[PDB]
Design a protein around this ligand. Structure first.
Ligand code: HEM
Ligand SMILES: [C-]#N
Ligand SMILES: [K+]
Length: 128
């Protein structure tokens, strides 16, 4: 946990400083409300079991931000390859992430830091 990490003088992860697991869960849920309501992205998830996806994304996002969560899903590149996702789509998604983190009360600078962790992933997500 955060305490035990501080006991070992490690630095505080983004995970810990946005509020940890409960925070990830709040964010991911608002995230998907947003995406699924955007007709520019909606259809990417037409054939998707969202309940499953959401459990997966909570683990992946939590781990990406330094949390102790296991990721039990598939590799990003295998998942996203073939799905015709462009940098345009990726950016729209990142915008919904940023809005969800704003809605939850996370400081702008920290949101920018989080995008700095996620953006690189575009290499694996996008078709290009
Ligand atoms: C870099 C940001 C993103 C991350 C971290 C991410 C992460 C994930 C994860 C963890 C899964 C579940 C993998 C599994 O089932 O084992 C997933 C699947 C999926 N992602 Fe992403 N994703 C990102 C961006 C996007 C974008 C931009 C789109 C489309 C606009 C997208 C569309 C999808 C779809 C349709 C699936 C699941 C297909 C299905 O099984 O129904 N993702 N992604
Ligand atoms: C990908 N959600
Ligand atoms: K695929």
């Amino acid at each position: 946990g955060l305490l035990s990490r501080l006991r070992k003088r490690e630095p505080i992860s983004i995970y810990d400083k946005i509020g940890g697991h409960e925070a990830i869960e709040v964010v991911v849920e608002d995230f998907y409300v947003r995406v699924l309501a955007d007709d520019q992205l909606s259809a990417f998830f037409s054939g998707t079991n969202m309940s499953r996806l959401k459990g997966k994304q909570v683990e992946f996002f939590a781990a990406a931000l330094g949390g102790p969560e296991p990721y039990t899903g598939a590799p990003m590149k295998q998942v996203h390859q073939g799905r015709g996702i462009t940098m345009h789509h990726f950016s729209l998604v990142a915008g919904h992430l940023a809005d969800a983190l704003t809605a939850a009360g996370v400081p702008s600078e920290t949101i920018t830091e989080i995008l700095g962790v996620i953006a690189p992933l575009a290499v694996d997500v996008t078709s290009g």
